[PDB]
Design a protein around this ligand. Sequence first.
Ligand code: A1A22
Length: 269
Amino acid sequence: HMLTNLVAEPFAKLEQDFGGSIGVYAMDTGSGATVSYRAEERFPLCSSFKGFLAAAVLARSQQQAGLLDTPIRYGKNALVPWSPISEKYLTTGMTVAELSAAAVQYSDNAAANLLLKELGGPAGLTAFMRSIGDTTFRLDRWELELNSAIPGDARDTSSPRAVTESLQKLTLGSALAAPQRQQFVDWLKGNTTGNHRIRAAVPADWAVGDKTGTCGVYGTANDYAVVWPTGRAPIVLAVYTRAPNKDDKHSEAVIAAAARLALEGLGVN
Ligand SMILES: Cn1c(=O)cc(CP(=O)(O)O)c2cc(F)c(C3CC3)cc21
């Protein structure tokens, strides 16, 4: 409900200092009050699709009772860069649940590609997002090609608003069965890669689950989170960045600052 104007000028100054574009959408699930800045624009997902990927696996698990316990074996050629958990279990395999936890909590790339294969590829994950009423999300490619973050390329993008809307449906709404919903929340709460992003803007006595993304080019990186402040309804928010030049660097500090401004706009402690 507006609230944006409490912080439209501060956001424009932050992105002028960063040297690129910042996109924010934050929802107070209590009042329905929102904060929006470039909330409709497309930004590259980078690794952030891995949280939605885990949610799609959990949705499939509601239909296929054995799915999460299924052992998956893989070869050395599956171990693309940034596979910190799957590289330790090459010789043993891992379960679908373990791959899902690795994809969410360590951004594990081999795990992400193996679970994409289970869902029928990038189109399969896109299909799941359409099934919960997200018409904006698109995944087009696999790891690592989906990280190209080419300016104006809609492949492998979504909008901050669509990301927040979908995250709310999956973590707090009715898109997942209750046990699956709590598993998704617990995976996000256990994320290890987000300490310098939205988490850096959240007090220690508030619960938070998040999923990061970092493309490594074009100043492109992001984070989305559900935050449970004490004594009020949860907040859902998405913070995405990009920049014009290929060797522009992302900034975790800019993502934490954007998160702070969003929470300040919502009037949150
Ligand atoms: C540079 N970088 C990070 O610095 C950090 C993560 C973890 P996340 O922030 O994406 O979750 C990272 C993940 C990746 F898949 C990639 C591939 C493009 C090469 C790069 C990453």
